Design an enzyme around this catalytic site. Sequence first.
Site, PDB file in Angstrom:
ATOM      1  N   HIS B 181       0.818  -1.212   0.000  1.00 12.06           N
ATOM      2  CA  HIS B 181       0.000   0.000   0.000  1.00 12.06           C
ATOM      3  C   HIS B 181       0.852   1.263   0.000  1.00 12.06           C
ATOM      4  O   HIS B 181       0.357   2.329   0.362  1.00 12.06           O
ATOM      5  CB  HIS B 181      -0.951   0.083   1.214  1.00 12.06           C
ATOM      6  N   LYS B 318      20.228  16.915 -14.513  1.00 12.71           N
ATOM      7  CA  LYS B 318      19.205  15.963 -14.104  1.00 12.71           C
ATOM      8  C   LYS B 318      19.157  14.803 -15.094  1.00 12.71           C
ATOM      9  O   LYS B 318      19.261  15.012 -16.301  1.00 12.71           O
ATOM     10  CB  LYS B 318      17.863  16.695 -14.048  1.00 12.71           C
TER      11      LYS B 318
END
Lengths: 459, 461, 460, 461
Positions: B181, B318
């Site tokens: 979860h 990045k």
Amino acid sequence: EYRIEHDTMGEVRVPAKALWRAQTQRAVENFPISGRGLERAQMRALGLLKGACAQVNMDLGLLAPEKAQAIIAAAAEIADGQHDDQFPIDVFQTGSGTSSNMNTNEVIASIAGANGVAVHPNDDVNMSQSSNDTFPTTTHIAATEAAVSHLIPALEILQDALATKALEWQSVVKSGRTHLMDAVPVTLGQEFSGYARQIEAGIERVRATLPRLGELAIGGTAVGTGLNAPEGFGVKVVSVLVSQTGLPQLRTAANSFEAQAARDGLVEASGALRIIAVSLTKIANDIRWMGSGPLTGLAEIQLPDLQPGSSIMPGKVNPVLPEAVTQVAAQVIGNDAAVAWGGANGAFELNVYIPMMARNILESFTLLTNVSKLFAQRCIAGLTANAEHLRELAESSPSIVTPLNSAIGYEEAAAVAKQALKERKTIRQTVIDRGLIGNKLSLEELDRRLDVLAMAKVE
Amino acid sequence: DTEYRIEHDTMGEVRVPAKALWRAQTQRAVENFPISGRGLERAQMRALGLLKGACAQVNMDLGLLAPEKAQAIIAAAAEIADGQHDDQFPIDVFQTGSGTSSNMNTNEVIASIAGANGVAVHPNDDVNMSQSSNDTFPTTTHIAATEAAVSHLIPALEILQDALATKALEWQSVVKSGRTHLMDAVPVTLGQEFSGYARQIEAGIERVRATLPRLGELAIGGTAVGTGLNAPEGFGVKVVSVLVSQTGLPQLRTAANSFEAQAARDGLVEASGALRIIAVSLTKIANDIRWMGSGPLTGLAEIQLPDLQPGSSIMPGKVNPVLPEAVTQVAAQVIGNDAAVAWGGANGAFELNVYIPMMARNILESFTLLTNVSKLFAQRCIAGLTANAEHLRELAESSPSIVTPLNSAIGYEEAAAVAKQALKERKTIRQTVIDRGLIGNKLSLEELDRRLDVLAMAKVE
Amino acid sequence: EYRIEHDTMGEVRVPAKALWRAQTQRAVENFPISGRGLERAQMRALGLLKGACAQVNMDLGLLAPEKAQAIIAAAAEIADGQHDDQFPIDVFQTGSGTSSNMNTNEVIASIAGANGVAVHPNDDVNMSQSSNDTFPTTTHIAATEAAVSHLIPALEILQDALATKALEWQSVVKSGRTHLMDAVPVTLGQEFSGYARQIEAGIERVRATLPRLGELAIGGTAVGTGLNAPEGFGVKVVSVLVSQTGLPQLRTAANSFEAQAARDGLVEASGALRIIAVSLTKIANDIRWMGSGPLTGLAEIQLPDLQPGSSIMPGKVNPVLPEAVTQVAAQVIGNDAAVAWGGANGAFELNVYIPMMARNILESFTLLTNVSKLFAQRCIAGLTANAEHLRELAESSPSIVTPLNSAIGYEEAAAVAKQALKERKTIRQTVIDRGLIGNKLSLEELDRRLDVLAMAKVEA
Amino acid sequence: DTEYRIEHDTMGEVRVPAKALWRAQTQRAVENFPISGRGLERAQMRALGLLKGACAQVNMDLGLLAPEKAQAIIAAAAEIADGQHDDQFPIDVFQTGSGTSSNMNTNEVIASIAGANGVAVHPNDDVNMSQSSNDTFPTTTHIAATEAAVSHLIPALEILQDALATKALEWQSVVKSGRTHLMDAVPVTLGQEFSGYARQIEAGIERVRATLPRLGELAIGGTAVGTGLNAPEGFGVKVVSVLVSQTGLPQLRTAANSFEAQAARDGLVEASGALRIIAVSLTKIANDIRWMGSGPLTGLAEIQLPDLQPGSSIMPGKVNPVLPEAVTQVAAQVIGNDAAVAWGGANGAFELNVYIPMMARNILESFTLLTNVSKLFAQRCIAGLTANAEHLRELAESSPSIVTPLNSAIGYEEAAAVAKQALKERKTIRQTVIDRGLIGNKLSLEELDRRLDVLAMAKVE
């Protein structure tokens, strides 16, 4: 032969004559997946947008005029289709379109350099921009242009063709069918008025998507905050885009974060195309059933012959345009599922399914535009009705007993229809044979009510 | 160019580009279906060439086709199969739904090649002898799809399964926190997770193989409606024998029922469904991998993916998980293609399903995308992953759910109070068990330490 | 025990106390497929429509007032839910809804008869009507009512909850993430403004379907021609329906043949719900990822605890409302595919997929209505932000070098970011270490540009 | 009723309706998920009861659970399995995606039943001993789905296959005109067409059977994350043995990989995909059958479907193909359900896919719909079809495409002129062949009549 280019990850060997540079070449090696890249309309929108961004950066004094004009001129060459072979990157690239954005930046840099002006693909050609706002902006430009300038005019041609047949055939009586079974009379014109309405409603459905399809992310840069772009950059670029395209439907996004974290407007646009695919399936299926035969089918209408039907069964001609339409509709339904799958799966500040979503929504626009015009012009316009056969079908339906309900009641009318079928007698003669002529129904009234053209209640 | 010649068919005269090898019926289809601008794939033209050569061989073997004509057709069909004439197939995918137009495209191009070699053959009477579009075109579709599955997709999936299984072994003791979860769970190892991904791909291969008995069924021999009218007895069986010898694919076979094989394309729906499961599995694998690589400093930072290209035109330095993005976008495309295939498959009528060219495009594309992206995913991403093992062990030790093995000693409810108090007071589970006075007859300190060891808790096998 | 009823096919044994008659009983035996029948809203619309048709037939002098009033009274009982157990027919019945239409006609006849008034299910209760216009009319009534009176108000509750967080967290800075990787600063408030716009746009999408969702086929009777109905019957019935429901979104169809040969308006309405499912998936996924942890995830926000998370792992709590939302979204997407499949497959004068399409569109309205309100009230409203953790994350992204691009250039800024990561240094210190302070970048300008709250460019 | 009693869980005390057998966690879920108003189906509660009894049996066999407690759990679980307590499962389908709530629902109801029989058992410590929701809830889902496939759907498909095959035999010599593209084609028999439908259903059974090796895989024993933590060695193997003995389903087996079995539900996607093909096949069969029954006077009128109910509230005496309509609507539902299953299946994260209750609802519904409608289609429609054989033979003889067997004698192009001239002058193919001067050394009058016999043209032998 090769030449060396570099990016911030290192040096890369690039084909000597290619106008792209290091990052495009990396993407060539990273994503050889489908072998297909951007469409013409996508490279047009990329060229248009890069020109508009350079114009605004020049207007605001952020980009020197010599650099800006060289970028504007190079971007115009790209928009015009002079360099489509310089975009080798697969559709299935990084999901922001970073690679195709850098492809455009690098090709512009090489064109400008060949013209004696040095511009950096990042610092100059990409000034004030991200892939994350420019690439979905080009996708929404291309999709808005497809909807307004191509699909709606093609649907208007199709609606007109169907409406013309609705008028021509307004009194061509035939048997209605419901559940595929004999029903009460209609006219061919009435049925075609229904088809025309479906296409007209399709146009309404496409138009209803435009306020959000036309939203552009330009100006939001990396995450939606507008970092590294000047104040009002997006508003100013959109103004240039509207002037260059003639599409007033283009606009800055209502919310700059929604416009990059999601591609919900592409899901919405695809959904309208999906309805049109559903409508066209019904229209095309009815038309090929109407043309079925000539001796073992309904034989209601004749479709224009377009090509020999069969390599083996000589003389047979097949409803090839309805087949192209229903296959296109199937493709649009599948493409629509792909678009929605991508649309649901953004994360935080960026949905990274844009190249795949772009491919599918633009293809659905293309297929529907092209097949709607062909359907109108090579099939609908030339249909002819077999009116004598159609009246015979109308007069043969046992359900022509229906207007007697108010005179004899439903249960007795059902007995009339079943006895008529069983004894191979007409409805009129069965009504007489069952003793129903009398106080409740005269012969004159019976014959008035059984008239099939009157029963179709033509307006 | 405006240079044309006049060709004819039974419908009349058509202007054809002067240098084109196709003839009247192909040109009609060029003008009838300008819809997508894309036509048959290489693999479809290969199968059309192979099939036309095989049919000429069998017709000749039976004495129905003169050997000189058969030689010229076989030679021309081989040129087509080899890819020497792909630019002579201009017809759209979105053509008549039996593939009549692409069948006639092949018949006409073969006739033109044979004629240039001094041998006259008729596109219908000779090149199409004993054939219909209705059995030949789905036959070429099922040949191409079977070849894609056996010779391309399964080997690519094996490469990916092996890369995942290699990490399952390499990382079998690299303990980390499980997550269920998205919440802190009990320990697992990275290797255990990758053993799961490896099983998903292994099961994906099983799913593709399970479709082959029906994907490999070919309609050839059923001619117009499935009855074999105008084909010699056993024609299809004989042609399949040639096809098996030529392709080396023993999965090709005559259909169990000749009417089912032309009235429906259920075998393509079946094959697409297997690819759809693979897309579902790949979505889970790729999503986990990019989440494990998320960061460097605001994400999970469990593993490092190989750098493949600069991530960003604006944010400098990045780097992004571009291969997981390619995989998940391919999976979306396969899902959509699968819906299109099933839509076409359901809508046959009587003796023929007329959605074959569209179905063919979508199933073959799904095969191609999954083949190519699976190999790239294995070789440019999975093979070079590295693990951040120290960070992973700290994650494993930090989950409050490591109290779970104490259930049998202190009970679920007390263990929950331990876990909640440890988090609120920023104490370890071990110290909270002591602070709540639980050390005694039911739980010794030595037993507590044995039960809380996170590597042992992962129960590596 | 049983009693005999009959239709034009013969006699049928019917449960002695049932208010339905022969044709309903046949359908009970023909379609035992799903075991589920019409929903409450469908029986309400059937009762409403049968009452309105009797009113107009009486107004026009076609139906005797004693019969019309008995039908109006019985239909009102059905609309009010007094006889839902008298509708035993499966969803997967004949695709025109003939069986449920006759179910309503027969039950009305039985109620009227017990009140001393004889009405014939066909000749009187079905006067001026077909199943082919009435049953899709009841479907479009129910779907329009669901959109206007239930789903849009529920989405407004969710939009408001998201917008309230957008304002509360306007200045709560954090690291943006693109491709799941460290990006430049945003605020939690900005993200929630995006979610709020998605729901606001969802409402716009539902609203946009109403001009065609609200089109009713009533009056077209068997095939669209209006045979056996008086002139203007549909217009008169719609007027009654609008007055009774307060829903002027209901209207006569632009084309009476389109309105029965196709159900394109249901496909359209389902498509809007499909977009909302797509939007909710993104919102719910972001929220459960922001709540992930407590110690192995992002731990950006705390979701309200709603129930123990785990039967085995003690004290663990899970994001159950995001899970309910994402599962509902999956259901809507599947229902949407079923609706479109039915929609495409009409033939000539009638699309015979109506009961299946009705089931799926009405279910999607119900699921989205109910889960949107629960999501807003049991999850969004009570979220709390871990503001100091978020600020640290904002400061930790190497991409905060981005505002230096105009001073040092993209390539040098990339070298700064890569070196800062490699050496575990700040961007600021790496800029200094690389000798970049000078005529292109002062120390004061560096510190102005690296302010992460300012870098998020909070507006308004 | 407004009376309540107090129960508690690890989050605190909860007011529970006074007579309910559920307790605190079920009541929380009642308040958290009022979404659809529908909960677990009978088969899901049966599988939960079966599995809880099997787990108690094994925990007792291993000396982990006292016999008095285990016996009381076994008795209570059997009451639940047999349907005595279905009104004690009020939780929505759209609950937490692991099924935690329905698992605790079962644990709490068992504890209350046992307590009313004088035996105290704890819902977590005893009823849930050695278990997680994450292995038990998908286990019950795969039990229910395997049972639906083996014991319900396959037998129903066999009934339909037999009905179609019987018509294929009865009508093996009932000649009619084939139709391709909806246009007049060469002769077939009704029997041949129904042999194609029978093969589609036979292949459908093959497709369902092919999913069973992975549909039958059960997660039981993997507990929280797949590692088996807090379960004894071999717990899953021992429980599966009990399940196989109790159900008689040898297809139930331990999963090949315990992580794949909880991180994904790929076997449910696979099983749904087979049902999706069956929906595709049934659409073709049902569409053909209602078109063949279309009329009585304005359609094809090839066959008569059994009357099942009055067709129309307004058009008197009309009867409609209501069973084909039910079939094609069910097929649409299966297609949509299948899309929902695949959507849930793709979106697992790390150690758990949390779409299980939604996926369970849709796969089990698809099994039910196809089972029930296939039997009704066979018994209320297929079995009673009658053929209009005289009309069919007239249609066969009317097709201008019966010129096709003359291709080898006169050539494709001349045969086209024969078919075209026959249509224009409303004359037979035989007469047109005579009128065009084709009788001679290439074709005699006797050979023409042999080639034009329509039943021989259908090539039944």
